[PDB]
Nucleic acid binder design. Structure first.
Ligand SMILES: [Mg+2]
Ligand SMILES: [Mg+2]
Ligand SMILES: [Zn+2]
Ligand SMILES: [Zn+2]
Ligand SMILES: [Zn+2]
Ligand SMILES: [Zn+2]
Ligand SMILES: [Zn+2]
Lengths: 927, 186, 590, 75, 185
RNA sequence: UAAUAGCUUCUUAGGAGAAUGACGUAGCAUGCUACGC
RNA sequence: GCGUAGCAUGCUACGUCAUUCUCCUAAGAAGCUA
């Protein structure tokens, strides 16, 4: 009977059970195994059918979170697992097993019974958080509710999962931190028990329930006692993004690691937490077999900087935030006591000391004067203490004695153009072309309320095993360019009449500093930054430009001391990218003279069933994790295999971090600490953003390929590719160039891509993306959720099933297929509202005159020409309006010139700017 | 050009040619004098082009020298400005507390983020709303950074002084938040 | 840079180089100006000199326009084009200029040196633009006249309070008083920079000055002084705003039984409220400065700006307001330098108050509800233009009398100026008559008004008082001592000293004297409060001493004597020299 | 063409207010900026007109800054 | 072109044309051809400098016009902006905007921002009884194309005045201008 | 107060190159004429 | 048949100028994009 089975399962333990199955038959559930065997691999959601599950009910007959899993299998496996359990019986991190043989129908089918497991395992939590689909999140909701993280009505909020709209979800997740930390401790206890019991086996997430107990010994082989080995490469690595999302180590800030006891009061003077980091690593990640260097200056290569920095990201959340930043030291010049920064304490790169420290000096050269007046040690040491309650970001010091509240002026209205437009039938009620782009004004609390958006930058620990392979694929994407250091005389600066950052903007533009410093003491400064760390302040400038939304836009003006060296370091590679045609990163490719059509044709590089895809990064420059910015900097620095040594490359990376990633930010006369995320003003910003975008796309493809079943993949080549992809991620520690090349070719064949720093058009294979062998929109949503801490709503992501209509939007240009000459080409046409708004609203009073600015309208008509071929007449009329306004401006300019003199201009070639041919020549491929 | 003897040769050849033409000399002599004048003016134009190139090169060199002189004079001005700024900021330092905390350091190295936190003698608090003001620095003295600070002045967003009695729950709408309360360590 | 022709308001780029102000002139007007007078240098965007490697020709009709430069007759390129031709002078906007017949008085305004009185009488009967330009270039001439003075230097310093004086050889020595300030120089090797603002005033003994300075620097023998030149700022506002009449009161609101003291001026208050601007003429001591305060009390809600060209007049106005007007709503704006001891009893320099008192030159750019300009007789067209430029107001009212002493006009040395041509508002007072008038003396004793009603005025002024028998006329020869370019009469001062201890009630008498030298030097000899007649205007005192230093056309002026004697309230001693002036008044025998 | 005419007059009106140094009064300038931004980001003409009335009341509140009679008698 | 070099070129061209019209042969023809060419070279050298001079003159004219217009526009920026604003405000012809502008011309300006939320406070200053009669009827206040309920009326003396104290005859004794505080209805 | 980078339009200046036309010098090939051998 | 001389025709090299075009650099103005 099915009742004798329940009685036997109860056992000697006084447990009251209620069968979840039906009539002593196996119960079928849809779990999230992390599996790797001879035929399947990956971290996917399978359908286990070998366990009979009974749930225990506590007093008052309430169902509790304890299950009796009664897995049945062969007899040899029964004996083997019984022996392995007998070895590991006494370990406290082992679910109490029960081995008995019950006559199911007429034969002794042997069962093993795991007692008091939770409903879900650790792999279910990891999968529900790494593969988050807000339309189907039922294990995440049940896990959150069943452990008192919320109250099952918290989900009636509209967007409870959004990080940028509902920041309380951070607390809701962090309620799982203690449970995750206890799971880590139980894992270490189980590893110690395996080591001491002489048992060799692999630890997988799907064998540790949410209490922490381990219960799967099917594939453990026992060797000589005292020399067993646990293989935890795939256990910790998959769990890594969850350790910072749930803040598993928030109980390490408390004395005796007790969440009830008060915080640990570290001495403020303490900045070298190397011993603390080593103790934390040996406590939680004990059997992680790869060496860990707390101070990344001791690392072996950029593959070891990523791993150790990824750990330092997690271990830096338990140390006080006042111990980071520059390390100042009191030096003397000609007997006068300076305070200068002779080191740094990065949250990711550990403690870094400068190698050229002159305690006793007498004269300060121009290089040394620039270095000492650039770093924020003097400014913060001589400034008043600040407590800015308007932001949650750390505030260092207030340089001045009163805060500056910078506003943004409204735009200047070009009334003549507006009257001309409405005389041409524009701006009617019910029209399709209407003004949407304006100059939005801002109050005094604009700059600080925009800087406060860095609170969306959270410390993110990445999946290091997967990231260390994504880096190889990305560097493969960047293998056609060449780079290296160049002398100061080879550096070309585009516009030298630009701000020099703080404090150098008080004495001149960048021209003064690029002229005053000879090539010798620019090379000397650059070679100084290769052996020393120069902290640098970056201003926050409110952007005075026309947009469609009223949010304030700010840009970071990095100091000239940083810009000069970063140019000298990266300009060769950056100019090599901007001069390459037909690559993945289309930077430096014009859209005129057939550029747009060429780019689109190169995107459709022989894909089988193409669908165009495009996604958006919400809060791209502010939510980018520090690990991915460090990864981008390392990828851009792989071209320095000969010019720079190892220490030179590390100190260049440290300067990049200390000047761009997390530096002192000057916002309204006050120094704040930027938590992270890329600044929009560093020298390599567009290119680093392109690297980050390619990294996200490759990670999305990797997750999409590994999360597929494996029994459903029909193509024997793709299933083998998934198998070898799992092997290359979580079973292989060195780089495998063969498989990196094979996966790169796979991506180029089926996931053709076009990148401009955050704008991407993908021409993927539709059949594969439907079968799950290539990233789709949902994979990008999941990857962004667990690797940027932002939710990518599918409203800003488009899909185009028909290639005759081109990408829906790339670089704010819609694409239309027109008949030009005798063939069909793609022409980029803008938003008509943008062109009309540029005509009507201008940012200077002298641009309201009109007759002075005819080149303005020539350029705007050049941009607005492709509207002429748009089927909608209200769109085609924008170009003709601009042409007729150019004609009117020229007529009245000639009238005014004839009045101001008595002679008309002898040479007048303006007659070609109101003929359509001058503009039609801009989209013809001849030039 | 004119100073060079080539112009004199051209002038004397032209004078001889004109005298011969007015005298009605023989045609062969006319041809010989025309050839002489042609070679004279050929040498003249050969010498003139070198003068034009030389004067243009001298002008561009003078422009370059003026540009370099201006840049050199600007370098000295920026150097003086940076030196004055550095020494003024040095003199502003609170030497006693700075020396105390730096000597208390084990290696002589301290994080920058604690220099103001433990040695600044003036604190500026920027407060966005009334609840924040009540919670952080209510009254005439308050505690922050493990010290005791006393209010010395409160100014609003307009930098117009605000009396502590005006900061009330009912008078809050009549203030230009944020208020920048400037305190001094006790 | 383009502009507008002064007498036609046409667009132009031509300015007369020879003219002091360099006024923008259209093509036709510039042609008529250069073809008529001695002015022959015209400044375009580029000057009209001859651009030869060596040449100095300035006459426009002598030059030609060739290629990209203007050349003379003997240097023009083979392709030439005249500058001054076809009845115009070449410049921007050639075919958009309409000329005028006002090129006749403008020539006289530009060329004349303002020394004779005819220039003033032709500079005050022209149109608005010409009135403005004439005043502008007259102020320019007055400011430029200071460039002909001399540089001072210091010999030694025996005492830090009595500095030694030394002037540059061969240059005139400017008079030493408060009106002139000097800024030092240290030109030696070694800091050719200013060393602060100092001033001078003659000491009694030897050659030493009890000087005064803003800072406390000590001068080496190498340091010396230089007079500071003052630039002339432009002016564009009309001298008078166009007078417009309203049907009823606009922008002003009366009061309920304002006061029992000012109830006789209510009709004139209504008249001021009715019109855009009004003029009040009143002989001294009839309440003009008492009419303005009554109007202020009559319009409490109206923001009122009280103004005056001098400092002592606005000081007396502030004192009277402190007596009558509420002091909480008061203000007093002072120039930063504050050379003269001003009136400091209200919240000084608070422009945002209701009742604002400030001198004309320091007026802030702000609005008002009615501005009362006090003592327009001392004001020039520059001052009226400035008050109409800086002070935009809903109502204007000018008070004063043509018979008072006019503005200094230092460079004027030939002839006399009639009262009606002092400034435009005074002319309006004389052409059709003032808008308000009230002839009744209210401050002076009966005797002095009875005597002054025959000197300048022809038996017009009645008074309400009794002759207190405190009026004394002293006759003495008064030996003359010309010390500092201003005459000093030492024996008269001595007789005053010997006839002061016999007058116990005259120990607080103010000393009034037309010459600043005697007025300043009498301070140590008698200790009495001192004040010159020019700065005494508008301020009344209960005890006044007047002395005629010398028999001159300046000291014995009828209007000056009238305005000097009309300051007394209960008694006055006059030390007179001229027999004619002495015989006309009826005082005690002595 | 009435909805787009309001959005431009709000721009001109805020420019006038900025020129009148309303920007120095933070509490008033915040409200003026908010009204301007809400007029620009409007879909209904009645709402934009009400906000324009509120924004113009700022200009009319300061009597001496603008010469309403001189400005309006030029039409 | 009226240039002496052009005159010489023209006479050489005419002489060559007449000769070739006769054109027997051949050396005289070649000599006149060379004379025409050498005169043409000199005239063309002159013309090149004329064209360069004209180009420089046009550059000067353009730059001068741009600078003059730019400085003029940066000068007349406040009056121009205010005139533009009131022109556009007239063009809208909204009933509320016209009402508040016409009132502000008469002196009936508000003291604070006109509020939009119902039952919010509005304070306006009424300068004369004629303005009170037009806009205020009973306890309702007609302003900005809306109806407002008067809460309290005060004078320049900050003294409360009852609504029954306002009349054609009693007003001359009152202390104008009043200040009316109202809530939107 | 106003960042990094890309592309495009326009203006000016300089340099180099090309093509054509003209002038001049030198050199070479051919034809015609005078004198001498 | 040769040499000297002159003229005519043609070719090449070099120099000068004019025109047109292309490019490379420098400076200035403007627009769009991320
Ligand atoms: Mg298992
Ligand atoms: Mg008076
Ligand atoms: Zn390492
Ligand atoms: Zn390198
Ligand atoms: Zn003149
Ligand atoms: Zn004129
Ligand atoms: Zn000359």
């Amino acid at each position: 009977d099915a009742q004798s089975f329940l009685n036997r399962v109860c056992g000697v333990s006084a447990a009251r059970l209620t069968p979840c199955g039906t009539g002593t038959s196996t119960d079928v559930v849809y779990r999230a195994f992390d599996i790797y065997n001879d035929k399947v691999a990956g971290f996917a959601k399978f359908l286990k059918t070998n366990c009979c599950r009974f749930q225990e009910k506590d007093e008052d007959d309430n169902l509790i979170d304890s299950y009796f899993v009664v897995k049945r299998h062969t007899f040899s496996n029964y004996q083997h697992e019984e022996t392995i359990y007998n070895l590991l019986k006494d370990c406290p991190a082992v679910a109490k097993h029960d081995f008995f043989k019950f006559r199911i129908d007429g034969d002794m089918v042997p069962h093993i019974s795991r007692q008091r497991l939770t409903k879900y395992t650790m792999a279910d939590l990891v999968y529900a958080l790494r593969h988050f689909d807000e339309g189907n999140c039922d294990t995440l909701k049940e896990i959150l509710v069943t452990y008192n993280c919320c109250d099952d009505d918290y989900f009636n909020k509209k967007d409870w999962y959004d990080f940028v709209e509902n920041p309380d979800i951070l607390r809701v997740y962090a309620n799982l931190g203690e449970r995750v930390r206890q799971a880590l401790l139980k894992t270490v206890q189980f590893c110690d028990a395996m080591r001491n019991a002489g048992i060799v086996g692999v630890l997988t997430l799907d064998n540790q329930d949410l209490n922490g107990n381990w219960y799967d010994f099917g594939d453990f082989i026992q060797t000589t006692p005292g020399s067993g080995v646990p293989v935890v490469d795939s256990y910790y690595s998959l769990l890594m993004p969850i350790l910072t999302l749930t803040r598993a180590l928030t109980a390490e800030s408390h004395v005796d690691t007790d969440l009830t006891k008060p915080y640990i009061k570290w001495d403020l003077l303490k900045y070298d937490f190397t011993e603390e980091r080593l103790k934390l690593f040996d406590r939680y990640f004990k059997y992680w077999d790869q060496t860990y260097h707390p101070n990344c200056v001791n690392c072996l290569d950029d593959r070891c900087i990523l791993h150790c920095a990824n750990f330092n990201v997690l271990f830096s959340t338990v140390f006080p935030p006042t111990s980071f930043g520059p390390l100042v030291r009191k030096i003397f010049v000609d007997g006068v006591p300076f305070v200068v920064s002779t080191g740094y304490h990065f949250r990711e790169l550990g403690v870094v000391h400068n190698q050229d420290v002159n305690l006793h000096s007498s004269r300060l050269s121009f290089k040394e004067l620039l270095v000492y007046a650039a770093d924020p040690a003097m400014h913060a040491a001589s400034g008043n203490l600040l407590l800015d309650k308007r932001t949650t970001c750390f505030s260092v010091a207030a340089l001045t004695n009163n805060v500056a509240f910078q506003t943004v002026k409204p735009g200047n209205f070009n009334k003549d153009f507006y009257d001309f437009a409405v005389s041409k039938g524009f701006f009617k009620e019910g029209s399709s072309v209407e003004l949407k782009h304006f100059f939005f004004a801002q109050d005094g609390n604009a700059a600080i309320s925009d800087y406060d958006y860095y609170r969306y930058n959270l410390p993110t620990m990445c999946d290091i095993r997967q990231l260390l392979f994504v880096v190889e694929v990305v560097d493969k994407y960047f293998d056609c360019y060449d780079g290296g250091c160049i002398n100061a005389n080879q550096v070309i600066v585009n516009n030298l009449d630009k701000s020099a950052g703080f404090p150098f903007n008080k004495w001149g533009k960048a021209r003064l500093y690029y002229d005053s410093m000879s090539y010798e003491d620019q090379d000397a400064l650059f070679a100084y930054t290769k052996r020393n760390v120069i902290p640098t302040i970056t201003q926050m400038n409110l952007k005075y430009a026309i947009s469609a939304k009223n949010r304030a836009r700010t840009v970071a003006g990095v100091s000239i001391c940083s810009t000069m060296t970063n140019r000298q370091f990266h300009q060769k590679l950056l100019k090599s990218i901007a001069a390459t045609r037909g690559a993945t990163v289309v930077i430096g490719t014009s859209k005129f003279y057939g550029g747009w059509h060429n780019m689109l044709k190169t995107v459709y590089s022989d894909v089988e069933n193409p669908h165009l895809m495009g996604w958006d990064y919400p809060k791209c420059d502010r939510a980018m994790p520090n690990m991915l910015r460090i990864m981008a900097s390392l990828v851009l620095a792989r071209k320095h295999t000969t010019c720079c040594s190892l220490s030179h490359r590390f100190y260049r990376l440290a300067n990049e971090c200390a000047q761009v990633l997390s530096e002192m930010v000057m916002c309204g006369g006050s120094l704040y600490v930027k938590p992270g995320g890329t600044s929009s003003g560093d020298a390599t910003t567009a290119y680093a953003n392109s690297v980050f975008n390619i990294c996200q796309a490759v990670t999305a493809n990797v997750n999409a390929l590994l999360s597929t079943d494996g029994n459903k993949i029909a193509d024997k080549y793709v299933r083998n590719l998934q198998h070898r992809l799992y092997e290359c991620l979580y079973r292989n520690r060195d780089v495998d160039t063969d498989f990196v090349n094979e996966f790169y070719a796979y991506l180029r064949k089926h996931f053709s891509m076009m990148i401009l720093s955050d704008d991407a058009v993908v021409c993927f294979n539709s059949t594969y993306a439907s079968q799950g062998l290539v990233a789709s929109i949902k994979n990008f949503k999941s990857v962004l959720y667990y690797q940027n801490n932002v939710f990518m709503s599918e409203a800003k992501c488009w899909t185009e099933t028909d290639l005759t209509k081109g990408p829906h939007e790339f670089c704010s240009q819609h694409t239309m297929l027109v008949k030009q000459g005798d063939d069909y080409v793609y022409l980029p046409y803008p938003d008509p509202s943008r062109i009309l708004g540029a005509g009507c609203f201008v940012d200077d009073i002298v641009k309201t005159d009109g007759t002075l600015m005819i080149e303005r309208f020539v350029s705007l008509a050049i941009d607005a020409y492709p509207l002429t071929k748009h089927p909608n007449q209200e769109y085609a009329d924008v170009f003709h309006l601009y042409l007729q306004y150019i004609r009117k401006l020229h007529d009245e300019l000639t009238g005014h010139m004839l009045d101001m003199y008595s002679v008309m201009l002898t040479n007048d070639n303006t007659s070609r700017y109101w003929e359509p041919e001058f503009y039609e020549a801009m989209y013809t491929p001849h030039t | 050009f004119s100073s060079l003897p080539s112009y004199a040769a051209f002038a004397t050849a032209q004078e001889a040619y004109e005298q011969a033409v007015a005298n009605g000399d023989s045609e062969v002599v006319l041809k010989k004098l025309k050839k002489s004048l042609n070679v004279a003016k050929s040498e003249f134009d050969r010498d003139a082009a070198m003068q034009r190139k030389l004067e243009k090169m001298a002008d561009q060199a003078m422009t370059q020298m003026y540009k370099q002189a201006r840049s050199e004079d600007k370098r000295a001005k920026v150097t003086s400005a940076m030196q004055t700024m550095l020494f003024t900021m040095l003199r502003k330092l609170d030497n006693d507390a700075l020396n105390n905390i730096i000597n208390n350091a084990r290696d002589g190295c301290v994080p920058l983020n604690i220099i103001p936190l433990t040695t600044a003698a003036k604190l500026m608090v920027v407060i966005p709303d009334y609840n924040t003001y009540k919670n952080t620095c209510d009254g005439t003295t308050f505690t922050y950074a493990s010290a005791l600070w006393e209010i010395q002045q409160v100014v609003d967003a307009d930098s117009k002084i605000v009396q502590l009695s005006e900061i009330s729950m009912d008078n809050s709408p009549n203030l230009a938040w944020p208020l920048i309360v400037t305190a001094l360590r006790a | 840079a383009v502009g507008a022709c002064v007498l036609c308001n046409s667009q132009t780029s031509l300015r007369c180089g020879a003219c002091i102000r360099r006024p923008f002139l259209c093509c036709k007007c510039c042609y008529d100006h250069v073809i008529s007078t001695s002015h022959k240098l015209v400044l375009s965007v580029n000057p009209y000199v001859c651009n030869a490697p060596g040449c100095d020709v300035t006459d426009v009709t002598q030059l030609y326009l060739g290629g990209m430069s203007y050349y003379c007759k003997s240097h023009k390129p083979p392709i030439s084009f005249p500058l001054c031709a076809n009845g115009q002078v070449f410049g921007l906007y050639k075919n958009t200029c309409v000329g005028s017949d006002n090129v006749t008085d403008f020539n006289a305004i530009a060329t004349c040196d303002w020394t004779n009185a005819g220039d003033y009488i032709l500079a005050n009967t022209c149109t608005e633009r010409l009135k403005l330009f004439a005043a502008e270039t007259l102020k320019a001439t007055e400011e430029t006249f200071k460039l002909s003075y001399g540089i001072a230097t210091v010999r030694e310093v025996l005492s830090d309070r009595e500095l030694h004086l030394s002037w540059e050889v061969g240059k005139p020595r400017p008079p030493l008083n408060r009106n002139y300030v000097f800024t030092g120089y240290r030109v030696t090797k070694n800091s050719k920079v200013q060393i602060g603002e100092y001033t001078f005033e003659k000491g009694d003994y030897g050659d030493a000055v009890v000087y005064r300075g803003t800072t406390t620097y000590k001068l080496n023998v190498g340091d010396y002084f230089v007079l500071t030149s003052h630039t002339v700022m432009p002016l564009s506002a009309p001298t008078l705003v166009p007078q417009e009449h309203y049907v009823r009161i606009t922008g002003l609101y009366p009061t309920l039984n304002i006061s029992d003291e000012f109830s006789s001026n209510v009709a004139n208050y209504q008249k001021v409220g009715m019109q855009k601007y009004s003029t009040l003429q009143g002989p001294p001591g009839t309440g003009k400065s008492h009419f303005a305060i009554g109007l202020a009390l009559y319009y409490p809600s109206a923001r009122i700006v009280y103004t005056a060209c001098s400092h002592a007049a606005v000081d007396a106005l502030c004192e009277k307001a402190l007596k009558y007007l509420p002091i909480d709503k008061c203000s007093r704006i002072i120039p930063a330098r504050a050379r003269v001891e001003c009136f400091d009893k209200f919240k000084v320099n608070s422009t945002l108050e209701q009742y604002v008192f400030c001198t004309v030159n320091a007026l802030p750019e702000t609005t008002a509800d009615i501005v009362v300009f006090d003592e327009i007789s001392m004001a020039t067209n520059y001052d009226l233009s400035v008050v109409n430029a800086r002070l935009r107001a809903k109502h204007y009212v000018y008070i004063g009398d043509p018979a008072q002493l006019p503005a200094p006009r230092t460079l004027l040395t030939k002839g006399t100026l009639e009262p009606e041509y002092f400034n435009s508002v005074c002319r309006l007072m004389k052409t059709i008559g003032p808008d308000m008038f009230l002839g009744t003396c209210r401050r002076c004793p009966a005797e002095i008004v009875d005597t002054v009603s025959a000197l300048v005025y022809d038996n017009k002024l009645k008074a309400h008082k009794d002759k207190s028998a405190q009026c004394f006329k002293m006759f003495y020869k008064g030996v003359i001592t010309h010390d500092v370019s201003s005459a000093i009469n030492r024996p008269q001062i001595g007789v005053v000293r010997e006839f002061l201890t016999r007058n116990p009630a005259w120990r607080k008498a103010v000393f009034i004297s037309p010459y600043n030298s005697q007025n300043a030097v009498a301070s140590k000899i008698l200790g009495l409060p001192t004040q010159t007649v020019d700065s005494s205007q508008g301020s009344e005192y209960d005890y006044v001493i007047f002395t005629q230093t010398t028999e001159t056309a300046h000291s014995c002026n009828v209007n000056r004597f009238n305005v000097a004697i009309t300051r007394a309230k209960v008694g006055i001693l006059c030390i007179m020299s001229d027999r004619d002036l002495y015989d006309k008044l009826q005082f005690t025998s002595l | 063409s009435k909805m787009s005419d309001v959005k431009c007059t709000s721009v001109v009106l805020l420019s006038v207010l900025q020129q009148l140094r309303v920007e120095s009064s933070s509490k008033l300038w915040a409200q003026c900026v908010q009204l301007h931004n809400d007029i620009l980001l409007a879909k209904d003409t009645t709402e934009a007109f009400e906000k324009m009335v509120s924004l113009l009341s700022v200009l009319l509140s300061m009597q001496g800054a603008v010469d309403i009679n001189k400005l309006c008698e030029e039409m």
